[PDB]
Design a protein around this ligand. Structure first.
Ligand code: LU8
Ligand code: LU8
Ligand code: LU8
Length: 283
């Protein structure tokens, strides 16, 4: 039989220290192709090792297609091939889109659904998985209004995370590194920050906040480890909840939920399954 492996690379949709992401075409269908830098080869290995262990399949997890290693004259080329989401990342989408109640809840419940699926151990199934780099750039928007979680290059089964989204116990190096629940709790902190980023873009009473990243008002761009530790650990700052949210029942409920993802004590934070239940009872 013919094994068609040619992918046409049509446009670059992302370029970074990680390498590049391309929109590609295989057999007439769009695919996304991540081409890894030498800097980030271990992220290709880790995601590939995870998918060789457990073939994750969930509506709110970016869909795996292939891991390719190709020998070159003097280098190895590493590609990860996934489903393609033409609307791009949640980070992108929130810059120039505002949300209503239904769209805001659909987005955040779909993220919670993907995250709970990663976190849960299923027997007979999947190992429990923590993401370790959850953020709005690592979430893609689908045409049906749900999102999917991407980038399992730092994931752990039972490179450091983006500093702006690191939990206090990562910044103060008290995290219990031998305890898998510790990594779930780090993802929940980051989820709370994503929930704040999305909620700001939900309109109520004709008001909306501009898109801003978490801690935009207290750290520089590309904040250092120390910059983040002083904000999150020493001063114990948390993102601002605007007064206008307290006129709106949905944003009032989402403020409470994000507070319960941001406790200093990791074991006080809500679980992804409890976040899902709370979100299903809003509106
Ligand atoms: C090697 O590399 C790539 C391969 C492919 C690809 C292309 N055509 C057909 C296939 C195929 C799938 C599955 C079987 C099964 C049939 C049932 N039988 C019991 C066992 C074998 C055979 C063939 C593949 C996997 C695409 C690629 O990119 C999209 C590849 O590069 C990453
Ligand atoms: C990697 O990705 C894609 C792959 C393919 C593809 C191409 N040739 C053959 C297959 C295949 C056929 C048959 C089995 C068997 C397995 C055992 N049992 C006996 C029943 C079923 C498995 C695999 C596939 C899945 C198509 C795709 O899209 C249309 C892919 O997605 C981009
Ligand atoms: C986060 O991480 C990964 C993401 C992806 C991925 C999947 N679908 C679509 C995209 C994408 C497409 C298009 C735009 C732009 C272009 C057109 N318009 C002007 C605005 C929107 C942005 C983004 C990506 C980047 C794949 C990955 O791996 C193959 C990723 O890594 C795991």
């Amino acid at each position: 039989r013919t094994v068609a492996r040619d992918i046409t690379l049509l446009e670059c949709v992302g370029k970074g220290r990680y390498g590049e992401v391309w929109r590609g075409s295989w057999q007439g269908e769009n695919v996304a192709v991540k081409i890894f830098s030498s800097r980030d080869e271990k992220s290709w290995f880790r995601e590939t090792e995870l998918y060789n262990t457990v073939m994750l399949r969930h509506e709110n997890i970016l869909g795996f297609i292939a891991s390719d290693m190709t020998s070159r004259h003097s280098s190895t080329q590493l590609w990860l091939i996934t489903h393609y989401h033409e609307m791009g990342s949640l980070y992108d989408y929130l810059q120039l889109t505002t949300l209503d109640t239904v769209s805001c809840l659909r987005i955040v419940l779909s993220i919670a659904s993907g995250l709970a699926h990663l976190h849960i151990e299923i027997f007979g199934g999947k190992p429990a998985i923590a993401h370790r780099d959850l953020k709005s750039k690592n979430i893609l928007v689908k045409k049906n209004g749900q999102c999917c979680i991407a980038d399992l290059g730092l994931a752990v089964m039972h490179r450091v995370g983006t500093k702006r989204y690191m939990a206090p116990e990562v910044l103060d190096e008290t995290i219990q590194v031998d305890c898998f629940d510790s990594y779930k709790r780090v993802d929940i902190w980051a989820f709370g920050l994503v929930l704040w980023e999305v909620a700001r873009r939900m309109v109520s009473n004709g008001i909306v906040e501009d898109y801003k990243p978490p801690f935009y008002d207290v750290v520089p761009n590309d904040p250092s480890f120390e910059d983040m530790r002083k904000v999150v650990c020493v001063d114990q700052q948390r993102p601002n909840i605007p007064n206008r949210w307290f006129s709106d029942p949905t944003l009032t409920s989402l403020a409470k939920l994000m507070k319960e993802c941001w406790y200093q004590n990791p074991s006080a934070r809500l679980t992804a399954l409890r976040i899902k239940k709370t979100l299903t009872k809003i509106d």
